Structure formats: structure tokens, C-alpha cells
Amino acid sequence: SFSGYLKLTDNVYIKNADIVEEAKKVKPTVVVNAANVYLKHGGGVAGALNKATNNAMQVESDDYIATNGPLKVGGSCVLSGHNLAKHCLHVVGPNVNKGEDIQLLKSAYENFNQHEVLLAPLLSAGIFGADPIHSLRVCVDTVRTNVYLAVFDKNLYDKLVSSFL
Ligand SMILES: Cn1cnc2ccc([C@H]3CCC[C@H]3C(=O)O)cc21
């Protein structure tokens, strides 16, 4: 099971870890990808998860978009977790660097409530351009299921713990 996490609330846990390395160790039922609407997994968490699957995540994702069209910002889809997890929940948080509405971050975290336990990154933070302190606050105030957050950047992890209310 999950180890070395700091408990933040009744249901939210956090650790300074690379989500690919965590997924390889734990083999969680669900790993969350920080996806975009086209499921083009180029960089950040998505680029890292897809590389760890030897591009199988991108081949599956292209077939999903060909059949279904793009996701909505704030939406999600459940696809295979390949060699990392049973499932991958691809969730699209708003990208502030593309000018998207930060108010959609709560809708994006609501997708997590459809799963009892998840390994996840902070949505909309990192290269998506939003404040990670705000993303952690929306996560705690929105997700009711058990979420294990992997924060890759050590300096960011220390900042998030020290500023958590
Ligand atoms: C590259 N990579 C691997 N595992 C990750 C988990 C998280 C992240 C990003 C998501 C937004 C906040 C940022 C971070 O926690 O440092 C990137 C990762």
C-alpha cells in the first residue's frame, strides 16, 4: 500500500514523489493523469506517464479521441493504466497558460469522487500555470474519496506542507 505520506485531512495524503515511480511501486487501482482535452501527452505528468508506458498510453488515447472527440476542460475519461495502474483517470484541469478559466478546477477535482482511492498529481499546477497552493486547497475542499498526492518538486512539496491550513 501507499507509504511515507503525510496525512493532511481525513481523506487527503501528500508525499514528495515522482508519480511514475510511485505508480510502479504501488500499482494503484487508479492513477490520475494531468491531461489536456486532446489527450496529447507531451510534457509534465502526462509526458512522464506516457513515456513510462512506452507510448502505449498515447496509442490508446488517439483511438479514444478518434472515436469520441475531445474531452471538456473540467472533464475526464477512464482508460487503461497499462504497466502503471489498473486504470488511468485522465482529468483535464484548466490551463492558465492557454487562458482557461481557473473556476473549472473544482469541476476537474469532482471527477476524483467517482473512485474510492486514487494516486494523483495537483491539477492545473506545474506547466498548467495555476497556483499549486490554490490547487491543493480546492482538492481538499472538493475530493471526498481517498487521494494520495504525489508532488514531484521537492521545493514545492516543502512550500505546500508549510503553508497548508
Ligand atoms: C514530472 N512528474 C512526475 N511526477 C509528477 C507529479 C506532479 C507533477 C506536477 C503536477 C503539478 C505540480 C507538479 C509537481 O508536483 O511537481 C509532475 C510530475
From Swiss-Prot:
Catalytic activity entry? Thiol-dependent hydrolysis of ester, thioester, amide, peptide and isopeptide bonds formed by the C-terminal Gly of ubiquitin (a 76-residue protein attached to proteins as an intracellular targeting signal)
Q: How does this protein lie in the membrane?
A: Multi-pass membrane protein
Which locations, inside or outside the cell, does it occupy?
A: Host endoplasmic reticulum membrane
Q: How is its activity regulated?
A: Inhibited in vitro by GRL-0617.
- Which domain of life, per UniProt? Viruses
Residues forming the Macro domain are 1-165
Q: What does this protein do?
A: Responsible for the cleavages located at the N-terminus of the replicase polyprotein. Participates together with nsp4 in the assembly of virally-induced cytoplasmic double-membrane vesicles necessary for viral replication. Antagonizes innate immune induction of type I interferon by blocking the phosphorylation, dimerization and subsequent nuclear translocation of host IRF3. Also prevents host NF-kappa-B signaling. In addition, PL-PRO possesses a deubiquitinating/deISGylating activity and processes both 'Lys-48'- and 'Lys-63'-linked polyubiquitin chains from cellular substrates.
Assembly and binders: May form homohexamers. Interacts with N protein.
**What protein name does the entry list?**
Papain-like protease nsp3
**Full-sequence range covered:** 1027 to 1191 of 7096
